[PDB]
Amino acid sequence: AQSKALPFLKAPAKLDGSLAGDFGFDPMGISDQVANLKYVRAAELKHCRVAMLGFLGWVVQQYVHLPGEIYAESNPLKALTSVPLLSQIQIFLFIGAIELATLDQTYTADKPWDLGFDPLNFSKGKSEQQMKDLEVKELKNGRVAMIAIMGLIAQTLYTGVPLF
Amino acid sequence: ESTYWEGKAPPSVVLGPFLSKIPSGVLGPASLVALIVGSYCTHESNIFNTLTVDTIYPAYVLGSFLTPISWGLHVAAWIQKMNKA
Amino acid sequence: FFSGNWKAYAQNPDTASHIFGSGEGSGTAILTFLGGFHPQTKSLWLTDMAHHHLAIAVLFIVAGHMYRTNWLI
Amino acid sequence: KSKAVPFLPRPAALDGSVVGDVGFDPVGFTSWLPLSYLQEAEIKHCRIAMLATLGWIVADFVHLPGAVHEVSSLAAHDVAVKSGALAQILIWTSIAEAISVIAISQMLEGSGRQPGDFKFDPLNFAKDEKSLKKMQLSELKNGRLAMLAFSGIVTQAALTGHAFPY
Numbered sequence: 001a002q003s004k005a006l007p008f009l010k011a012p013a014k015l016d017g018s019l020a021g022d023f024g025f026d027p028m029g030i031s032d033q034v035a036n037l038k039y040v041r042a043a044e045l046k047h048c049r050v051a052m053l054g055f056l057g058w059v060v061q062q063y064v065h066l067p068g069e070i071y072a073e074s075n076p077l078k079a080l081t082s083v084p085l086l087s088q089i090q091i092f093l094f095i096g097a098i099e100l101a102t103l104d105q106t107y108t109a110d111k112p113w114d115l116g117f118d119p120l121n122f123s124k125g126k127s128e129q130q131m132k133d134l135e136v137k138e139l140k141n142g143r144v145a146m147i148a149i150m151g152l153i154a155q156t157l158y159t160g161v162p163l164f
Numbered sequence: 165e166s167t168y169w170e171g172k173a174p175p176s177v178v179l180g181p182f183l184s185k186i187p188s189g190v191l192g193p194a195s196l197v198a199l200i201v202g203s204y205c206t207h208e209s210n211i212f213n214t215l216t217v218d219t220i221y222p223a224y225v226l227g228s229f230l231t232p233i234s235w236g237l238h239v240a241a242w243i244q245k246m247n248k249a
Numbered sequence: 250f251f252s253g254n255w256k257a258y259a260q261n262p263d264t265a266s267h268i269f270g271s272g273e274g275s276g277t278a279i280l281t282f283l284g285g286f287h288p289q290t291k292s293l294w295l296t297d298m299a300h301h302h303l304a305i306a307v308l309f310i311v312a313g314h315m316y317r318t319n320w321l322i
Numbered sequence: 323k324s325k326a327v328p329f330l331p332r333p334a335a336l337d338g339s340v341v342g343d344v345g346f347d348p349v350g351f352t353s354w355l356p357l358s359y360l361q362e363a364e365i366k367h368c369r370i371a372m373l374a375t376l377g378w379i380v381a382d383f384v385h386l387p388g389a390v391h392e393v394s395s396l397a398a399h400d401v402a403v404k405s406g407a408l409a410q411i412l413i414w415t416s417i418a419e420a421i422s423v424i425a426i427s428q429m430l431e432g433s434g435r436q437p438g439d440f441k442f443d444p445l446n447f448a449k450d451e452k453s454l455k456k457m458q459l460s461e462l463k464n465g466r467l468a469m470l471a472f473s474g475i476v477t478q479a480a481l482t483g484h485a486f487p488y
């Protein structure tokens with residue numbers, strides 16, 4: 001009834017109105033245990049962003065490579081082992097440096113997903129409806145990418161073909 | 165509610181809202197049939213014919229599971245009979 | 250497993266001349282009843298313990314649905 | 323008192339439902355289970371049987387967009403579980419049914435979901451209540467006929483080997 005995604009079920013109590021992308025999709029009632037939807041939305045958006053970047057990297061590594069030889073592997077899962085540990089540890093350290101401040105931030109803030117990242121100011125001057133539309137676009141694209149990046153990983157692990 | 169009881173038989177609510185509405189004249193014969201079927205399945209999988217890897221027969225196994233069940237069915241049959249059902 | 254021919258996982262167990270950690274005298278079975286001990290290591294068969302844990306897993310997963318939760322049963 | 327069985331009395335739980343309540347319950351199954359759960363099970367069986375009857379009949383006549391699809395809908399099950407199509411259909415069916423547990427559990431508990439209702443009318447074939455009730459009765463009658471027909475089809479196609487007459 002109240003779920004748009006599952007037009008027959010009634011959504012849970014915490015799925016209503018605000019927090020764009022709310023289509024009443026919580027059949028298992030996971031939202032009933034979390035105190036609020038702030039942390040789960042932060043986790044969902046982090047997954048969405050990481051999955052978008054992962055899909056883009058998957059395709060680009062399929063087609064484009066860095067000039068060096070160590071980056072010449074086309075299969076992303078094979079490149080996970082071919083690439084030297086120095087590059088991967090540098091990436092991990094960069095991510096952890098970004099992650100510790102946001103670790104302090106996420107567990108207490110009202111909008112843990114709002115990291116203040118807008119270098120090009122794509123949100124300055126946008127109205128509330130436009131901002132909500134942008135949030136919906138981001139969430140949609142992220143969910144589709146998550147499904148897609150998991151599918152790419154599965155098909156590479158099951159057939160060895162990284163794409164198509 | 166109030167599954168607690170002190171009389172001769174417990175209230176029918178202790179049977180769940182599926183056995184609470186079965187007439188005792190149905191549960192009784194069903195319990196006896198289930199017990200006989202389960203005993204025969206157990207005695208056909210084993211005892212009469214020795215078990216082997218090639219002979220497991222999910223019917224006899226699933227059947228044999230009716231013996232433990234039978235116990236519950238006739239307990240419920242007695243509970244229904246004593247509760248005027 | 251999907252075909253239901255579960256006996257196939259018990260066919261051709263480890264022989265009585267199997268050297269542990271080596272392919273000499275080994276088998277292809279993964280879930281068996283053998284009882285007793287390995288003739289070489291004097292310990293329970295690995296295929297016996299795998300079958301034991303599979304049976305325990307099925308039994309406990311079944312028994313974990315006993316108590317009531319948000320789905321009325 | 324019953325409309326379907328004049329001898330036996332009308333079932334206590336069957337008074338009126340647009341699902342085709344003609345008071346046919348000689349064994350009193352409606353006393354055992356909630357009527358809503360039985361209605362959901364009946365509608366599920368109806369839809370599955372209709373799809374299966376149509377698929378069996380069609381796949382014996384024109385079904386070969388490839389090589390592995392050159393079977394006679396009697397050896398099709400094993401061939402296409404070996405191929406892997408049945409695995410995918412089972413995966414999606416399992417997802418749908420796992421969602422259906424909550425749908426069945428949201429009813430029998432409150433809400434307003436009628437048995438067998440999934441709000442799937444993309445083409446809007448039903449417009450008002452009268453059309454909805456008429457086509458619910460039609461769907462259930464067709465589903466019962468399809469249940470019996472598929473039962474006959476499998477029993478005959480296993481008792482012999484033949485085509486559409488079976």
Ligand code: CLA
Nearest residue numbers: 019021022023024025026030031040041043044047143146
């Ligand atoms: C990391 C994954 C992740 C996380 C944390 C969330 C989190 C959230 N989603 Mg969400 N979503 C995701 C992935 C995820 N989503 C994907 C991939 C899709 C596309 C199908 C969606 C589609 C979606 C819709 C349409 C809606 C939500 C909503 C919500 C919010 C409320 C539901 C809730 O509390 O569930 C928390 C979820 C988890 C804790 C995840 C548990 C992990 C389970 C067990 C998944 C198990 C694996 C799965 C079955 C199969 C994956 C394998 C492969 C096939 C992909 C919450 C912020 C609702 C919303 O906006 O509310 C504000 C809403 O309406 N989501």
Ligand SMILES: C/C(C=C=C1C(C)(C)C[C@H](O)C[C@@]1(C)O)=C/C=C/C(C)=C/C=C/C=C(C)/C=C/C=C(/C=C/[C@@]12O[C@]1(C)C[C@@H](O)CC2(C)C)CO
Nearest residue numbers: 365366369370373387388389390407411414415416418419
């Ligand atoms: C690519 C391909 C195959 C191939 C090819 C080529 C590339 C094309 C050509 C080459 O030459 C060969 C080859 C092989 O490569 C395509 C495959 C076919 C597809 C993609 C079709 C799928 C069939 C769908 C079916 C059969 C689903 C059945 C429905 C059920 C519903 C169940 C329900 O119970 C549920 C769960 C809820 C209930 O409420 C009611 C209902 C809805 C009835 C199952 O009962």
Ligand SMILES: CC(/C=C/C=C(C)/C=C/[C@@]12O[C@]1(C)C[C@@H](O)CC2(C)C)=C\C=C\C=C(C)\C=C\C=C(C)\C=C\[C@@]12O[C@]1(C)C[C@@H](O)CC2(C)C
Nearest residue numbers: 052055056117118119120121122141144145148151163164
């Ligand atoms: C990357 C992406 C968006 C990236 C946006 C970025 C970085 C924007 C960053 C900024 O805005 C901020 C944040 C703040 C601004 O102030 C600054 C900038 C910097 C401007 C979306 C991708 C979104 C990506 C999506 C939605 C991908 C969907 C993929 C699908 C459907 C793939 C399917 C398949 O892969 C399978 C599954 C199997 C294959 O075999 C077959 C096919 C078909 C190829």
